[PDB]
């Protein structure tokens, strides 16, 4: 409990494991952009499948621009509880509050990305 | 103040601030703050200061008086003392060498002060002060290091 209500698409424990596993796979294929500034740039260039954010940023407003940009481009987005967990999945020694998986031609993760995309929109009902 | 009710004195002050808008408002705001402390208490002065803190034509006496009022109170919240100094230094920090020296002496002499902040105050004072005022601050601080103050 004790989660900011502004992080509405809060994935549960089961979906969190699927998300962080796919993020870790995307790092091995060079298909991930790390950081809120880099995540914003992919949305402007229209090369992102989905956006993962961390719900435990002490001021949550520092990432709330991303949901607005995602709704314009029709890109799914979710929140996870720990920025430490998101940082380790990205392969970085520092906490990460937002990451973006990018569009790759011929990517082997296409079936897994599509299943995760379908899972995210279910949270929006 | 002498021969009329308290509410009418506040009414006179508010009308005066509407009529006088320019640099002549500087003296009016100071007398308004002094009346609030005497007619009311510390709470009345805080209410008047909050209302007037955004009307940009100011003087250093506006913030020096409020700092003195905070010191007379038994609480002496050090956070409020720094808060008044930052607002004054935002308005007159580019030219007032005395105001920077007063802020630095507050951190040393006050029982609640944090003397280790004096290093960053000196660094901030040198960059913000311009021309002769910067060199005056150097002389004033050098005098302060010895007992001549």
């Amino acid at each position: 409990a004790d989660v900011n209500p502004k992080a509405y698409p809060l994935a549960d424990a089961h979906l969190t494991k699927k998300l962080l596993d796919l993020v870790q796979q995307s790092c091995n294929y060079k298909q991930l952009r790390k950081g809120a500034n880099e995540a914003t740039k992919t949305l402007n260039r229209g090369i992102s499948e989905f956006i993962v954010m961390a719900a435990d940023a002490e001021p949550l407003e520092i990432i709330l621009h991303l949901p607005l940009l995602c709704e314009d481009k029709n890109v799914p987005y979710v929140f996870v509880r720990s920025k430490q967990a998101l940082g380790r999945a990205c392969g970085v020694s520092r906490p990460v509050i937002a990451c973006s998986v990018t569009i790759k031609e011929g990517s082997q993760l296409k079936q897994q990305i599509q299943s995760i995309q379908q899972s995210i929109e279910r949270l929006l009902v | 103040e002498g021969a009329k009710s308290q509410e009418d004195t506040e009414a006179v002050f508010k009308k005066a601030l509407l009529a006088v808008i320019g640099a002549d408002s500087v003296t009016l705001k100071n007398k308004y703050l002094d009346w609030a402390y005497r007619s009311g208490g510390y709470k009345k002065a805080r209410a008047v200061f909050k209302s007037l803190q955004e009307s940009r034509p100011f003087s250093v006496d506006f913030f020096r008086k409020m700092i003195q009022f905070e010191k007379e109170q038994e609480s002496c919240n050090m956070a409020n003392i720094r808060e008044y100094y930052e607002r004054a230094l935002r308005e007159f920090g580019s030219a007032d060498s005395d105001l920077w020296m007063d802020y630095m002496k507050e951190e040393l002499n006050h029982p609640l002060g944090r003397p280790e902040n004096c290093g960053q105050i000196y660094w901030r004072a040198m960059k913000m002060l311009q021309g002769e005022s910067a060199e005056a601050f150097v002389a004033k601080h050098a005098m302060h290091q010895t007992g001549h103050l």
């Binding site: - | 040393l108 003397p115 280790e116 004096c118 290093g119 000196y122 601080h141 050098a142 290091q145």
Partner: protein, 44 residues
């Protein structure tokens, strides 16, 4: 039986900031001694 780590000079931030300021800006040694030795003590 328990193991306690005593404070060290380099780990304390305030002491390092005090030691990185120029000497003429620095206050008197009496204040520095109080702050330094209080930092070296174990808090309870």
């Amino acid at each position: 039986n328990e193991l306690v780590q005593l404070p060290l000079t380099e780990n304390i931030p305030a002491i390092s900031e005090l030691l990185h300021t120029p000497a003429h800006v620095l206050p008197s040694a009496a204040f520095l001694c109080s702050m330094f030795v209080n930092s070296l003590l174990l808090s309870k």
